[PDB]
Design a protein around this nucleic acid. Sequence first.
DNA 1: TTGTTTACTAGCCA
DNA 2: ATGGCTAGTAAACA
DNA 3: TTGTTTACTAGCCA
DNA 4: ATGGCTAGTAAACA
Lengths: 248, 249
Amino acid sequence: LPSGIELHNRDFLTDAAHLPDASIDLIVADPPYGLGKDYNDSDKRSGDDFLAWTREWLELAIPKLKPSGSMYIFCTWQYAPEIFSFLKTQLTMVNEIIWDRRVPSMGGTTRRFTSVHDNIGFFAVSRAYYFDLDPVRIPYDADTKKARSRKLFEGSKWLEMGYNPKDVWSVSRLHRQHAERVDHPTQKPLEIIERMVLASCPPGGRVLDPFMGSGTTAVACARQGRDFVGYEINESYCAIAHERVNAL
Amino acid sequence: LPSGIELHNRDFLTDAAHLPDASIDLIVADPPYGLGKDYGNDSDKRSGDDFLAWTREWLELAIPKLKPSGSMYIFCTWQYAPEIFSFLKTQLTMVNEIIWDRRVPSMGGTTRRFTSVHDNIGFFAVSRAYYFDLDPVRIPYDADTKKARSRKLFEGSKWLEMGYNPKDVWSVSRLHRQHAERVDHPTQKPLEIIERMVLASCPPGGRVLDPFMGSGTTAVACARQGRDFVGYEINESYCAIAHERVNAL
DNA sequence: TTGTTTACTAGCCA
DNA sequence: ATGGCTAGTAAACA
DNA sequence: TTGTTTACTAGCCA
DNA sequence: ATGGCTAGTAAACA
Ligand SMILES: Nc1ncnc2c1ncn2[C@@H]1O[C@H](C[C@@H](N)CC[C@H](N)C(=O)O)[C@@H](O)[C@H]1O
Ligand SMILES: Nc1ncnc2c1ncn2[C@@H]1O[C@H](C[C@@H](N)CC[C@H](N)C(=O)O)[C@@H](O)[C@H]1O
Ligand SMILES: OC[C@H]1O[C@@](CO)(O[C@H]2O[C@H](CO)[C@@H](O)[C@H](O)[C@H]2O)[C@@H](O)[C@@H]1O
């Protein structure tokens, strides 16, 4: 395991104290959504119970942010207004990013529009948070270049280097047979996590994942060169995280 | 003006008495986002608690106008969506959170954030027996995509042979100024998405309310789809365009 | 071209 | 207050 | 092929 | 407390 890469198979809430306050540049928080998934009982909480537990781990993770830190939190629309409304009292919301998973959730419903997107709250401790777009700009290919280029835009940073990813990221969910896929139920694309890691944490900086699971953020910090602290209570997920960071 | 489509050049929050309680099948509300736009008025200049109290006020007037099967779509920005949705969940139940991918991002010149190309829409319902019909809004596959999707497991399926759910993310590009449908409105919404709402959550003949009709896109939607419509808008210029868009059908 | 699957069925009736 | 039966649900990876 | 624009800069300075 | 100046921000309509 590399320098700065820390994998703790420990309950984050008990072992948060073991992490120094104001010592993490970025928190990549993909916690249980409260959707009844089989991880333990972590995602088997619903309603005000789940909201209370969410707040409980958030008040432990927030103080560990440096004055320049930022945070991305994954959630479902079913709870996003409340969790975001709470986090707006503690930090400032810089963005709401929509992961358009392209592939919709199945079930067989016809009484509503099917879920295709996940909500991501992008918060910051202060207005002097760190944000660097250049590493995450998306380049135009030759054809997309020739289409967007005009003598009003020639030389513009968005044209030559790349455009802003925007607050909706259209990336397909990892198929079970995808090369990236491992033995985790709710994996996250490396594209997404890597974008966030590059855009809000200095090189060699510290990224905390209170609910790390497969080490997706761990892999994202291994490459791109950033320090990482992870917390996953499931032994098998920590194993797969190790294998994922020990193959780069 | 056609029958069943009513256009009012007044303030909504004050004519709410006129509207009967439990008469509206569907509310399609596109309110001021609290963003500083100039609608010819200063309604979108409110921010923070001012904006949110004003929002909750007009909402407390609009909600009783929905009959039990009633539903509501509400446009908003991510800066105020958590609070607005949190309040509305105490009144009605949230069925969906639809994200309007406007495809074209907001301009300004920032490099410290992610440019906006999403608007939030809250889909709430009064009861669990709310009206909803997906078949009018199913998206049919074309001769190439259905072929790419058709497997023996899916042959004869409702979603394959007819059309799939539009999902809670609608990637409909914003209306360019030179676009044919575009009128002289600062924040015009495309006819596609409002027509989708009108077709799905309002039965043929039902009454739709747009407290902030603007250019009357909901009026055109209700006229083209055989649904009654009522609207409110203080700008007479916007109401004039709202008219013209309906008489042109 | 094809098997298969991913964080988000639901309304009745009993 | 609580299950079970039903008609039903996409895009994209290997 | 090309002009033009649409609900959402941002920090500094005199 | 107030503009102004800067360095910038894109898909898609006509
Ligand atoms: N108290 C807890 N502390 C640390 N991890 C937890 C805790 N409770 C649940 N978890 C784990 O958090 C993970 C949530 C996952 N959605 C994270 C997946 C991860 N983002 C990935 O891309 O693979 C689950 O695997 C849980 O086992
Ligand atoms: N009290 C008010 N009552 C009725 N309309 C109002 C009020 N305040 C502001 N408005 C208008 O509400 C509209 C908000 C816009 N989103 C309407 C756009 C409209 N959905 C369209 O299709 O273009 C503005 O045109 C306002 O002038
Ligand atoms: O608006 C529904 C919304 O509420 C949530 C919590 O955000 O669930 C709560 O409210 C439901 C109302 O239908 C109850 O069924 C549920 O018991 C309660 O927790 C979400 O599940 C849903 O998105």
